[PDB]
């Protein structure tokens, strides 16, 4: 709202180039003032004409020429912010700052949004914020400052003409105040619509395989076309709403500038005003009427910049999970839960209710249970996905909240259920866990995950490009690449969540070989519905409806009839399809 807040937002958004932006705007303002002065030089020049006084005609023509030269050089230098790389540098710095904020925002709240919606902010909102600042500044300074200076100098030439020329600038204020809420609402609505459309388009692209199956012409794509038509109707309605206001503003401005000339003509025929000064004023007005009529329309870009700044600051206002009473590196790696009860956002589940457990160091523990029990919740809260409302989780004797996210992510290496590969080469996909590793170490990690076989069968070798989500690889190959990625990173705690869902029996045994090798010197947490792989665990934790119902080892759990025994019987139970 307040222009001071808008100014400080713009300065913050520009960042290190704030002084360059201020200097460029000062140059543009000086150029507008000097252009107004140059127009003011017409009054003696036209008075020099009609009389033939060549000496002072040249004397004032030199002044006009130097004024025009200063105006041209000032505008050329002030517009360099767009073309000398300062705008690009500011955009790059803003993108870097926004990207870092993505790295620090709580992951739970971030997952409540959409990737396409965030794409419209880090990419589109930035260009709406910065790409038109210099141009809009140049247009508004030309629109207002130059005619203002011309009228102020007319006041020196003729106080009656100057006063009536100046009387239009107060007239623009009520129209601007009347039209500002409409422009603000229109810009906000268009921004929200564009963000929603970006999210919908990204989701539509990411699910073309599912969409093609349903068929029936277009059903979800029918919703996409409905969104397109709704955007068209929104834009058309907004334009129609402001068309009458724009017509009224243009009429009022251009006819208030058409009564200045009439008053000057009346004064001239009355004999109290010089005809040459009248011609100079008329030339100024005719060269000023068109830009001044649509000054309010020009303020729409300022409203757009303000809306982009507001969206960017709202995104940047998200606070990270507090790091209270910062501590040092834990020396043991025995994860302990203590009365942990976690509730998901917008979820009444109260999952992981009053859960207390222990993950001994230099051992391997397993989590079993039904789908939705809360094992992935345990894995996520161990990575500080969200703060527990009750209970404490400690890597060693140190609570997670006493650590910064960097340290915790350094102590944790995870194979995720949702296997995610990066859109680059396989070598870099494995190496991102620990880039400062020897190629022999990378090959050893690949061998441990039993993935060198199909890497050898890759014509591009390790340089084979991986598509979005690692599409070019199979599910098992991608999952083994993720396993190798986690293996390459040397972390005290290794959390694997269903490591072998998409692996065959031989590949799964080969992977379990390295998993068992990991046990001796690393804390290992393993999630598995294939109970055969995790039968050898030192401890097995049974989860049901967010509670750890039963504890024990493979022999101990199978000795007493419980949920683990029932799960093993179901796994061993034959499956009948009846033809």
């Amino acid at each position: 709202l307040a222009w001071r807040v808008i100014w400080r937002q713009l300065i913050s958004s520009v960042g290190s180039q704030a002084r360059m932006l201020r200097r460029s705007m000062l140059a543009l303002l000086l150029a507008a003032f000097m252009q107004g002065i140059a127009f003011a030089c017409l009054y003696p020049i036209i008075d020099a004409l009609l009389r033939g006084d060549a000496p002072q005609l040249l004397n004032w023509a030199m002044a006009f020429s130097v004024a025009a030269i200063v105006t041209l050089v000032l505008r050329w230098y002030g517009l360099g912010f767009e073309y000398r790389g300062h705008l690009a540098q500011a955009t790059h710095e803003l993108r870097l700052r926004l990207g870092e904020q993505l790295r620090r925002v709580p992951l739970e709240k971030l997952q409540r949004g959409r990737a396409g919606e965030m794409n419209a902010l880090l990419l589109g909102s930035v260009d709406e914020n910065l790409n038109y600042v210099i141009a809009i500044a140049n247009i508004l300074l030309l629109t207002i400052v130059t005619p203002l200076t011309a009228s102020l100098a007319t006041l020196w030439i003729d106080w009656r003409l100057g006063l009536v020329m100046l009387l239009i600038f107060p007239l623009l204020v009520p129209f601007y105040y009347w039209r500002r809420p409409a422009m603000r609402r229109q810009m906000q609505t268009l921004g929200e619509a564009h963000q929603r459309l970006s999210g919908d388009i990204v989701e539509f692209a990411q699910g073309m395989m599912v969409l093609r199956t349903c068929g029936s012409d277009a059903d979800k794509s029918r919703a996409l076309l409905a969104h397109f038509n709704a955007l068209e109707n929104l834009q058309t309605r907004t334009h129609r709403q402001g068309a009458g206001a724009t017509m009224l503003i243009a009429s009022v401005v251009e006819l208030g500038l058409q009564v200045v000339v009439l008053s000057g003509i009346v004064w001239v025929v009355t004999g109290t005003l010089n005809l040459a000064f009248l011609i100079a004023a008329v030339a100024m007005i005719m060269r000023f009427a068109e830009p001044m009529a649509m000054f309010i329309s020009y303020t729409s870009v300022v409203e757009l910049i303000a809306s982009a700044l507001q969206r960017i600051e709202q995104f940047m206002a998200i606070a990270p999970l507090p790091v209270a009473e910062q501590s040092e590196m834990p020396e043991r790696y025995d994860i302990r839960f203590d009365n942990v009860s976690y509730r998901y956002e917008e979820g009444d589940g109260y999952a992981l209710n009053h859960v207390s457990l222990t993950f001994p160091a230099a051992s391997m523990s397993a989590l079993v249970g039904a789908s939705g029990a809360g094992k992935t919740t345990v894995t996520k809260l161990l990575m500080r996905y969200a703060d527990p409302q009750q209970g404490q989780i400690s890597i060693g004797g140190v609570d997670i909240r006493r650590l910064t996210p960097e340290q915790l992510n350094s102590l944790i290496s995870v194979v995720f259920q949702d296997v995610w590969l990066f859109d680059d080469t396989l070598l870099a996909n494995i190496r991102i866990a620990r880039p400062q590793a020897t190629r022999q170490e990378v090959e050893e990690a690949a061998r441990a995950a039993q993935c060198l076989e199909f890497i050898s069968r890759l014509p591009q070798g390790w340089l084979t490009p991986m598509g979005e989500m690692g599409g070019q690889l199979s599910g098992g190959e991608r999952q083994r690449i993720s396993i190798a990625r986690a293996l390459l990173k040397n972390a005290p705690v290794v959390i694997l969540d269903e490591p072998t869902a998409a692996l065959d029996i031989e590949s799964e045994l080969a992977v379990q070989k390295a998993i068992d090798n990991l046990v001796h010197n690393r804390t290992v947490i393993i999630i598995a519905h294939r109970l055969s792989t995790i039968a050898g665990a030192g401890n097995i934790l049974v989860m049901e409806e967010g509670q750890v119902v039963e504890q024990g080892t493979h022999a101990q759990l199978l000795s007493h009839h419980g949920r683990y025994q029932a799960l093993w019987q179901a796994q061993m139970a034959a499956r009948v399809w009846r033809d």
Binding site: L96, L102, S371, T376, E468, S474, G476, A570, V576
Partner: protein, 571 residues
């Protein structure tokens, strides 16, 4: 090929109307300046009389000028909105009609860039330049004639100013050549990096600790900023010169010095000079608004070239015979397939097998064998290099897309949910489906129990990829979505993964009770599913190595014996 002229074809009538009204407004503005110059001349000749008729002429011409300008701008804006809608709809339809492999390779970030940002860039051009183009082509052409009729020497001077500006602008043309490809690739890579950063945040935070934010995102940002700096430097001179040569000050400077020279030569006419000064805004100041948006118009031109490059991609050879299947039986005849990426060997070498209707065919083999490959080829993901895939005797190539997809209900290996509602996700492709059918389909699977447990029930919201829902729960939702269709062949790609054995057994028994005569294609690594099936097909290294029942393949003593023995020893 004039891309700017090409894009306005769907809204050509309205664009031409805007051009015509802008030209009419320009001519009316010239008339206003002529009437006002006549008023000044009358005042000069008679310093005691009001030029009432010329003043009425100038005020009326001013009124018509701004009315026509505003109406033309409104027409241009409506045409721009209509063109944006048409282009976005055409892009969405092309994306639907594009082959799945081509669209997957091009990327979701590229789709977001072309569909949203490139179409958005059309607004600047269509709604804010075509009236300005019309003004810049109308005012100078009439103004030069008017000034030659008025005073040919000042006309020559101002025409020389305009010619100097135009010649300098034409000489300095970057042409946007040999760098459009890099500009695009940088733009879509930045978009894809942002999307990848957002959707893979747990992996980024866990592993990518080397760089603040995300490393690939940083690399893309640096490439984009290099491209932007190069583009801005290459276009700086033309833009800044057009901003200083089309300013009123150069024209006024030349006119004033020419008038002084004429006074020195004893041939200066005051009224003609005044009328030239009033009318001189039409030659060089008319092109000024267009050059204020020339750079954004160049960006729009690049985006237009990208859009029309996207629309120029080949489709998946749709036929016109429209033959129908009548058997619901699958046949692979010596099919060989290579993915667009030039992988060594082949995904499939000589695959050939017949699955008659009603058969519970189970697909087994090690990872990378090509089970998902044959499933995708059945789904018309691409076309086989050799052989033929047929459903009910008729080839897939000899089918309409609707005809082929009315045959197969497919459960993908990757479980994707379109956010939205669980009930909406299950009823995808048919919003009119009653909730009773959705609940029945979820009861065929095991999703209904956990769905009822959720507080909003079926109307529970799920994340962009289904992140608000468990992996096993997400797969159950996808299974229910496929089952709601009731299509003749049901293909599953590891549908019982991410699930505990109790849920797996319940799903198997319920689905066996459900797909009684339906042909069921099964991809499963858990061999407990395939121990009782109508036929088992084993793939290894892209070759169909074995085919038969569990007993048959066990007695054969081949690749299936080792797999089954290892699986049984494990459990």
């Amino acid at each position: 090929r004039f891309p700017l002229w090409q894009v306005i074809t769907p809204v050509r009538r309205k664009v031409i109307l805007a051009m015509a009204l802008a030209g009419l407004a320009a001519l009316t503005s010239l008339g206003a300046l002529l009437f006002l110059a006549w008023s000044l001349r009358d005042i000069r000749a008679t310093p005691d009389a009001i030029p009432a008729w010329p003043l009425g002429g100038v005020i009326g011409c001013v009124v018509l000028t701004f009315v026509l300008r505003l109406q033309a701008f409104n027409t241009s804006h409506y045409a721009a909105f209509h063109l944006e809608n048409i282009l976005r709809s055409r892009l969405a339809r092309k994306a639907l009609q594009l082959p799945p492999g081509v669209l997957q390779q091009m990327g979701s970030g590229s789709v977001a860039k072309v569909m949203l940002d490139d179409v958005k860039s059309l607004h600047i051009f269509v709604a804010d330049s075509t009236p300005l183009y019309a003004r810049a082509i109308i005012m100078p052409l009439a103004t030069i004639v008017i000034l030659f009729w008025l005073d040919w020497r000042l006309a020559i001077a101002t025409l020389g100013v305009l010619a100097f500006g135009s010649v300098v602008l034409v000489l300095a043309r970057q042409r946007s050549e040999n760098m459009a490809q890099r500009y695009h690739k940088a733009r879509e890579q930045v978009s894809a990096a942002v999307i990848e950063f957002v959707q893979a945040m747990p992996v980024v935070r866990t592993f990518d600790s080397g760089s603040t934010s995300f490393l690939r995102y940083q690399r893309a940002l640096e490439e984009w900023v290099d491209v932007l700096k190069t583009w801005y430097r290459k276009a700086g001179f033309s833009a800044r010169f057009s901003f200083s040569i089309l300013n009123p000050l150069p024209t006024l400077f030349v006119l004033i010095w020419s008038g002084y020279g004429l006074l020195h030569y004893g041939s200066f006419d005051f009224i003609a000079w005044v009328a030239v000064l009033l009318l001189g805004s039409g030659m060089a100041e008319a092109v000024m608004p267009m050059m204020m948006l020339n750079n954004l118009v160049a960006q729009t031109r690049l985006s237009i070239q990208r859009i029309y490059q996207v629309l120029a991609m080949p489709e998946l050879s749709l036929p016109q015979s429209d033959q129908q299947p009548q058997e619901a039986s699958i046949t692979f005849e010596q099919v060989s397939f290579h993915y667009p990426q030039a992988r060594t060997g082949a995904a499939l070498q000589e695959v050939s097998f017949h699955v008659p209707a009603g058969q519970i065919v189970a697909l087994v083999g090690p990872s990378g064998a090509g089970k998902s490959t044959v499933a995708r080829l059945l789904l018309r993901y691409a076309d086989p290099d050799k052989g033929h895939i047929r459903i009910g005797g008729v080839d897939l190539r000899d089918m309409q897309t609707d005809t082929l997809m009315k045959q197969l209900s497919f459960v993908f290996q990757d479980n994707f949910l379109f956010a939205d509602t669980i009930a909406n996700n299950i009823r995808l492709g048919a919003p009119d489906t009653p909730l009773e059918a959705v609940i029945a389909a979820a009861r065929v699977a095991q999703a209904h129990d956990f769905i009822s447990a959720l507080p909003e029930g079926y109307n529970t919201r799920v994340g962009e990829r289904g992140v608000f829902l468990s992996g096993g729960q997400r797969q159950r939702i996808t299974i229910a979505r496929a089952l709601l269709q009731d299509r003749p062949i049901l293909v599953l790609d590891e549908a019982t993964a991410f699930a505990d054995p109790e849920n797996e057994a319940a799903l198997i028994k319920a689905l066996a009770a459900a797909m009684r005569g339906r042909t069921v294609i099964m991809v499963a690594h858990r061999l407990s599913m395939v121990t009782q099936a109508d036929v088992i097909l084993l793939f290894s290294d892209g070759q169909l190595r074995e085919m038969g029942n569990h007993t048959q393949l066990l007695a054969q003593g081949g690749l299936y014996q080792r797999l089954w023995q290892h699986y049984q020893q494990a459990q």
